[PDB]
Design brief:
part of a larger assembly, 2 chains, A: 68 residues, mainly alpha, B: 75 residues, alpha+beta, elongated, Prohibitin-2 (chain B)
């Protein structure tokens, strides 16, 4: 998750390390961009199911109105 | 002078990104980038950016942009 939240810091420190490593090979690195980032799907699926349970609670609330 | 007919007239682009947003919802965002080529600074374009400069340039910068800013933005 540090790669989602701290994308920019990872990109910058990667930039520093990559610039100092590329200096030994005669290539000046103008920009260093962290661009790809993906993770397990089932985590998002579980989060969505959690939201679904919350919305089911909301439905049960409207049914509580129904039920008075 | 090798020429190659460089098109300083505009050529557009479009790139997308699946981001893990703030709610960690998979946010697929598209983004149409209009990058154009220069005349009195044709160099960096033509050779080492290649005739295919825009292709070499835009894709993963757009990806970084969308993922950084959408991990920052909720659904």
């Amino acid at each position: 998750g540090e790669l989602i939240t701290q994308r920019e810091l990872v990109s910058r420190q990667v930039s520093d390390d990559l610039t100092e490593r590329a200096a030994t090979f005669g290539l000046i690195l103008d920009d260093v961009s962290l661009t790809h980032l993906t993770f397990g799907k089932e985590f998002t699926e579980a989060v969505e199911a959690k939201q679904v349970a919350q919305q089911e609670a909301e439905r049960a609330r409207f049914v509580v109105e129904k039920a008075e | 002078q090798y020429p190659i007919i460089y098109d300083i007239r505009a050529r557009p682009r479009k790139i997308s990104s699946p981001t893990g947003s703030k709610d960690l919802q998979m946010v697929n965002i598209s983004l149409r980038v209009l990058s154009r080529p220069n005349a009195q600074e044709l160099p960096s374009m033509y050779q080492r950016l290649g005739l295919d400069y825009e292709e070499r340039v835009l894709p993963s910068i757009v990806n970084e942009v969308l993922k950084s800013v959408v991990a920052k933005f909720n659904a």
